[PDB]
PDB file of C-alpha atoms and ligand atoms in Angstrom:
ATOM      1  CA  UNK A   1       0.000   0.000   0.000  1.00 30.71           C
ATOM      2  CA  UNK A   2       1.224   3.555  -0.642  1.00 29.23           C
ATOM      3  CA  UNK A   3       1.018   6.236   2.016  1.00 28.91           C
ATOM      4  CA  UNK A   4       1.701   9.895   1.271  1.00 25.03           C
ATOM      5  CA  UNK A   5       3.680  11.957   3.795  1.00 25.46           C
ATOM      6  CA  UNK A   6       1.879  15.305   3.564  1.00 26.69           C
ATOM      7  CA  UNK A   7      -1.454  15.769   1.759  1.00 25.85           C
ATOM      8  CA  UNK A   8      -1.617  17.347  -1.698  1.00 26.11           C
ATOM      9  CA  UNK A   9      -2.804  20.632  -0.156  1.00 25.32           C
ATOM     10  CA  UNK A  10       0.261  20.577   2.065  1.00 22.17           C
ATOM     11  CA  UNK A  11      -1.590  19.358   5.221  1.00 25.02           C
ATOM     12  CA  UNK A  12       0.603  17.556   7.767  1.00 26.69           C
ATOM     13  CA  UNK A  13      -1.002  14.124   7.614  1.00 26.83           C
ATOM     14  CA  UNK A  14      -0.445  10.559   6.447  1.00 25.99           C
ATOM     15  CA  UNK A  15      -2.693   9.671   3.531  1.00 27.77           C
ATOM     16  CA  UNK A  16      -4.229   7.316   4.429  1.00 24.42           C
ATOM     17  CA  UNK A  17      -3.601   7.599   8.191  1.00 21.81           C
ATOM     18  CA  UNK A  18      -5.592   4.518   9.188  1.00 20.16           C
ATOM     19  CA  UNK A  19      -5.487   1.323   7.166  1.00 20.26           C
ATOM     20  CA  UNK A  20      -5.355  -2.453   7.361  1.00 21.02           C
ATOM     21  CA  UNK A  21      -2.914  -4.789   5.661  1.00 20.24           C
ATOM     22  CA  UNK A  22      -2.118  -8.470   5.437  1.00 19.93           C
ATOM     23  CA  UNK A  23       0.974  -9.947   7.023  1.00 18.84           C
ATOM     24  CA  UNK A  24       4.103  -9.370   4.992  1.00 20.00           C
ATOM     25  CA  UNK A  25       2.428  -6.743   2.748  1.00 16.99           C
ATOM     26  CA  UNK A  26       4.709  -3.751   2.074  1.00 17.89           C
ATOM     27  CA  UNK A  27       3.949  -0.194   3.092  1.00 20.34           C
ATOM     28  CA  UNK A  28       5.626   2.426   0.952  1.00 22.22           C
ATOM     29  CA  UNK A  29       5.697   5.823   2.637  1.00 22.90           C
ATOM     30  CA  UNK A  30       6.516   8.508   0.106  1.00 19.89           C
ATOM     31  CA  UNK A  31       7.632  12.045   0.740  1.00 22.66           C
ATOM     32  CA  UNK A  32       4.825  14.132  -0.735  1.00 27.36           C
ATOM     33  CA  UNK A  33       4.554  17.606   0.845  1.00 27.22           C
ATOM     34  CA  UNK A  34       5.606  19.626   3.873  1.00 29.15           C
ATOM     35  CA  UNK A  35       8.793  17.630   4.526  1.00 28.25           C
ATOM     36  CA  UNK A  36      11.008  16.832   6.227  1.00 26.76           C
ATOM     37  CA  UNK A  37       9.083  13.853   7.463  1.00 22.55           C
ATOM     38  CA  UNK A  38       9.837  10.521   9.145  1.00 19.92           C
ATOM     39  CA  UNK A  39       8.057   7.407  10.385  1.00 21.84           C
ATOM     40  CA  UNK A  40       8.586   6.171  13.936  1.00 21.66           C
ATOM     41  CA  UNK A  41       6.686   3.283  15.480  1.00 22.89           C
ATOM     42  CA  UNK A  42       5.610   3.633  19.086  1.00 20.76           C
ATOM     43  CA  UNK A  43       7.317   0.886  21.107  1.00 17.76           C
ATOM     44  CA  UNK A  44       4.498   0.993  23.684  1.00 15.92           C
ATOM     45  CA  UNK A  45       1.853   0.770  20.967  1.00 12.37           C
ATOM     46  CA  UNK A  46       2.698  -2.183  18.716  1.00  9.74           C
ATOM     47  CA  UNK A  47       2.174  -5.923  19.173  1.00  9.05           C
ATOM     48  CA  UNK A  48       3.998  -7.529  22.085  1.00 10.51           C
ATOM     49  CA  UNK A  49       7.482  -8.767  21.219  1.00  8.29           C
ATOM     50  CA  UNK A  50       7.941  -6.625  18.071  1.00 11.43           C
ATOM     51  CA  UNK A  51      11.229  -4.636  17.925  1.00 12.69           C
ATOM     52  CA  UNK A  52      10.332  -1.081  16.849  1.00 15.00           C
ATOM     53  CA  UNK A  53      13.916  -0.444  15.741  1.00 15.77           C
ATOM     54  CA  UNK A  54      13.407  -2.997  12.969  1.00 14.64           C
ATOM     55  CA  UNK A  55      10.405  -1.215  11.436  1.00 13.28           C
ATOM     56  CA  UNK A  56      11.043   2.490  12.182  1.00 14.58           C
ATOM     57  CA  UNK A  57      13.275   5.317  11.107  1.00 11.56           C
ATOM     58  CA  UNK A  58      15.562   6.750  13.747  1.00 10.45           C
ATOM     59  CA  UNK A  59      14.005   9.803  15.365  1.00  8.86           C
ATOM     60  CA  UNK A  60      16.974  11.721  14.002  1.00  7.39           C
ATOM     61  CA  UNK A  61      16.703  10.440  10.392  1.00  6.77           C
ATOM     62  CA  UNK A  62      14.620  12.538   7.968  1.00  5.79           C
ATOM     63  CA  UNK A  63      13.222  12.344   4.414  1.00  9.24           C
ATOM     64  CA  UNK A  64      13.735  15.888   3.229  1.00 10.30           C
ATOM     65  CA  UNK A  65      13.119  15.713  -0.546  1.00  5.54           C
ATOM     66  CA  UNK A  66      10.009  15.032  -2.661  1.00  5.97           C
ATOM     67  CA  UNK A  67       9.762  11.368  -3.699  1.00  8.36           C
ATOM     68  CA  UNK A  68      11.981   9.801  -1.010  1.00  6.23           C
ATOM     69  CA  UNK A  69      10.344   6.666   0.308  1.00  3.51           C
ATOM     70  CA  UNK A  70      10.708   4.417   3.344  1.00  4.64           C
ATOM     71  CA  UNK A  71       9.382   0.902   2.889  1.00  4.65           C
ATOM     72  CA  UNK A  72       8.433  -1.609   5.577  1.00  4.80           C
ATOM     73  CA  UNK A  73       6.624  -4.912   5.894  1.00  6.13           C
ATOM     74  CA  UNK A  74       4.832  -6.006   9.082  1.00  7.65           C
ATOM     75  CA  UNK A  75       4.075  -9.634   9.968  1.00  9.42           C
ATOM     76  CA  UNK A  76       2.813  -9.866  13.567  1.00  9.08           C
ATOM     77  CA  UNK A  77      -0.933  -9.240  13.755  1.00  8.16           C
ATOM     78  CA  UNK A  78      -2.346  -6.454  15.916  1.00  6.12           C
ATOM     79  CA  UNK A  79      -2.420  -2.654  15.848  1.00  5.84           C
ATOM     80  CA  UNK A  80       0.636  -0.485  15.244  1.00  3.57           C
ATOM     81  CA  UNK A  81       0.610   3.181  16.208  1.00  9.81           C
ATOM     82  CA  UNK A  82       3.031   5.386  14.350  1.00 12.94           C
ATOM     83  CA  UNK A  83       3.917   9.075  14.127  1.00 14.24           C
ATOM     84  CA  UNK A  84       6.145  11.636  12.399  1.00 14.29           C
ATOM     85  CA  UNK A  85       8.555  12.889  15.124  1.00 18.28           C
ATOM     86  CA  UNK A  86       8.925  16.541  13.944  1.00 17.19           C
ATOM     87  CA  UNK A  87       5.175  16.981  13.287  1.00 19.75           C
ATOM     88  CA  UNK A  88       3.669  14.698  15.917  1.00 20.88           C
ATOM     89  CA  UNK A  89       2.208  17.745  17.721  1.00 21.32           C
ATOM     90  CA  UNK A  90       0.588  18.899  14.490  1.00 23.65           C
ATOM     91  CA  UNK A  91      -1.403  15.637  14.492  1.00 21.63           C
ATOM     92  CA  UNK A  92       0.731  13.764  11.924  1.00 24.19           C
ATOM     93  CA  UNK A  93       0.038  10.297  13.400  1.00 24.82           C
ATOM     94  CA  UNK A  94      -1.449   7.063  12.105  1.00 26.13           C
ATOM     95  CA  UNK A  95      -2.339   3.486  12.935  1.00 26.07           C
ATOM     96  CA  UNK A  96      -2.091   0.307  10.865  1.00 27.24           C
ATOM     97  CA  UNK A  97      -3.756  -3.001  11.645  1.00 25.14           C
ATOM     98  CA  UNK A  98      -2.249  -6.267  10.501  1.00 26.51           C
ATOM     99  CA  UNK A  99      -5.175  -8.698  10.277  1.00 24.15           C
TER     100      UNK A  99
HETATM  101 CU1   CU B 101       5.753  14.390   9.007  1.00 21.34          CU
END
């Protein structure tokens, strides 16, 4: 599934921000608008036993040009909360469910 970082009107959101996937399906996050942007998974808000480090950017790593992507695949089922560290306060957050 593709997820935009930044809406086409420059809003600071994931598009889509809530979605479901199958195990091992890829998520491609692509730098769209209002960068820099990143994707960090919340260690306290993903399935038990998952290593967030494995599926996130570092807090300090950024995508700062149009069309940069980060790709990840999830396999454990459950809900995964994620956010953009620099724009978390702006409401740039999301949640994916692996079902
Ligand atoms: Cu962002």
